[PDB]
């Protein structure tokens, strides 16, 4: 992911 703001 590039630009993630919600981790799994």
């Amino acid at each position, epitope marked *: 992911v590039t*630009g*993630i*703001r*919600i*981790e799994d």
Partner: antibody, heavy 122, light 114 residues
Framework: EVQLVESGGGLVKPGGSLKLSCAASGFTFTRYAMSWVRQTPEKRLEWVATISNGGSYTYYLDSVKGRFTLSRDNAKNTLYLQMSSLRSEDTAMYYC???????????????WGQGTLVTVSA | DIVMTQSPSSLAMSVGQKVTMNCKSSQSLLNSSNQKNYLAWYQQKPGQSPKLLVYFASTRESGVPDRFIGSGSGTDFTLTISSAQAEDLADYFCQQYYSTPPTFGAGTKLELKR
């Protein structure tokens, strides 16, 4: 009943430090990304910074980079915006908001707080 | 850094008349993979915080009045208020969330026509 309470904003001199807190209620704080958006005296909406739900990845406005530090506390459901080296361009109303959309990229904000007023002046 | 252009800055309206607002971006907010435009609309009464009206160009938020209409694609977007009401006299902002940073427009004031 989502609720966002901002505090910590006040009158500060140029170059001084100030930290804004944002308490969140009515929803699961760990499931959403939180953001700060400021509105200038000229009524211009200006996004400041965005932090992921786990706090690992932080995104800041370019003009503010290196001076504002975003910090999240998922144990107390509180968002913290550290502000250092404050300039007379930073005096604005600072709004705490809850990001929407997916895991990646920016998104719209449904719920906003009432906002803290920050006035930078000598 | 995308530039949002709102037209016009002020809007003179009469109660019950259809109202149209324009918003243009320096980039295409169209994601060809999901065919969805990345543009939101906010309303702000004086002394209050911005209230979301329509996101994804045309998708209306829950609770928002049905008279608000979101339309447009690519670099051009429109907010439409069919049968405008005196409660709708406010500032309106458009925001893109395609790219980082999130940018807003200058805003469009809705004023009463006299």
């Amino acid at each position: 009943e989502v609720q966002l309470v901002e505090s910590g904003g006040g009158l500060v001199k140029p170059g001084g430090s100030l930290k804004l807190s944002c308490a969140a209620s009515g929803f699961t704080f760990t499931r959403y990304a939180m953001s700060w958006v400021r509105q200038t005296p000229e009524k211009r909406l200006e996004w400041v910074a965005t932090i992921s739900n786990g706090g690992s990845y932080t995104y800041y406005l370019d003009s503010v980079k290196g001076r504002f530090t975003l910090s999240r506390d998922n144990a107390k459901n509180t968002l913290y915006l550290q502000m250092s080296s404050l300039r007379s361009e930073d005096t604005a109303m600072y709004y705490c908001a809850r990001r929407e959309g997916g895991q990646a990229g920016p998104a719209w904000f449904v719920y906003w707080g009432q906002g803290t007023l920050v006035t930078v002046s000598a | 850094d995308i530039v949002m252009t709102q037209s016009p800055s002020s809007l003179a309206m009469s109660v019950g008349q259809k109202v149209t607002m324009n918003c243009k971006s320096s980039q295409s907010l169209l994601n060809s993979s999901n065919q969805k435009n990345y543009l939101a609309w906010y309303q702000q009464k004086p002394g209050q915080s911005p209230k979301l009206l329509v996101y994804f160009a045309s998708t209306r938020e829950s609770g928002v009045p049905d008279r608000f209409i979101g339309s447009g694609s690519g670099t051009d977007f429109t907010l439409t208020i069919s049968s405008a009401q005196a409660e709708d006299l406010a500032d309106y902002f458009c925001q893109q969330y395609y790219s980082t940073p999130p940018t807003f427009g200058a805003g469009t004031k809705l004023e009463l026509k006299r």
